[PDB]
Ligand binder design. Structure first.
Ligand SMILES: CO[C@@H]1[C@@H](OC(N)=O)[C@@H](O)[C@H](Oc2ccc3c(O)c(NC(=O)c4ccc(O)c(CC=C(C)C)c4)c(=O)oc3c2C)OC1(C)C
Length: 188
């Protein structure tokens, strides 16, 4: 509704602050959704990838988000990313967000743009034998005026802590950006 605009007006009210700590909290919110699923009993691997264009991917091997109709009459995946930390907050502060779900033998995809406005509905794009959810968002430069570039070392301390706090959970962090390519993995 106007709820996505509200986040875009006072981001600090929803995230912790409107700085580099807030920008990295967008990533932690998406990782927390995969941790929730690990704790639900499904999944043992989380992959975080900093893409060449400055977007970030968070991939898991959980069951994959449910695709049915939510109590509001609207599809579930759409509700999660558009209704008010919450994945809707990430979506509001992103110039673009994409979801990819591997569930019930199928691959579902849904795209959002310019602050969380659905660019498409949930679309069946192929078939799979793999399960899980992959979220890829690009934070908005008009919100984080100073910077939108993720810091490998900042993400790494937090993912290390999540891997230590949970146990039997392999967290991999990757950086694809030109000249600063790095790969790390954490498992306790
Ligand atoms: C951002 O989405 C998050 C998820 O994030 C990720 N990465 O998976 C995750 O944190 C969590 O994921 C859930 C949260 C709830 C369910 C959930 O409620 C499910 N269903 C069952 O637990 C279930 C278990 C037994 C059973 O007989 C039925 C039948 C269903 C009926 C009668 C409606 C359903 C299910 O399959 O997957 C679920 C999943 C994957 O919640 C979201 C969707 C907000």
């Amino acid at each position: 509704l106007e709820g996505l605009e509200a986040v875009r007006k006072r981001p600090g009210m929803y995230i912790g602050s409107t700085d580099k700590r807030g920008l990295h909290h967008l990533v932690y919110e998406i990782v927390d959704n995969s941790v929730d699923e690990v704790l639900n009993g499904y999944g043992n691997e989380i992959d975080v990838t900093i893409n060449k264009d400055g977007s970030i991917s968070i991939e898991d091997n959980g069951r994959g988000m449910p695709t049915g109709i939510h109590k509001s009459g609207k599809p579930t995946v759409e509700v999660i990313f558009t209704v008010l930390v919450g994945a809707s907050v990430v979506n509001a502060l992103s110039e673009w967000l994409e979801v990819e779900i591997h569930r019930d033998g199928n691959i579902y995809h849904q795209s959002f743009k310019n602050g969380g406005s659905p660019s498409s509905g949930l679309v069946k794009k192929g078939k799979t034998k793999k399960t899980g959810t992959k979220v890829t968002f690009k934070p908005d430069d008009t919100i984080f005026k100073a910077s939108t570039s993720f810091n490998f070392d900042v993400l790494s301390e937090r993912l290390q802590e999540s891997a230590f706090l949970l146990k039997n959970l392999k967290i991999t962090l990757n950086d694809l950006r030109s000249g600063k390519e790095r790969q790390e993995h954490y498992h306790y």
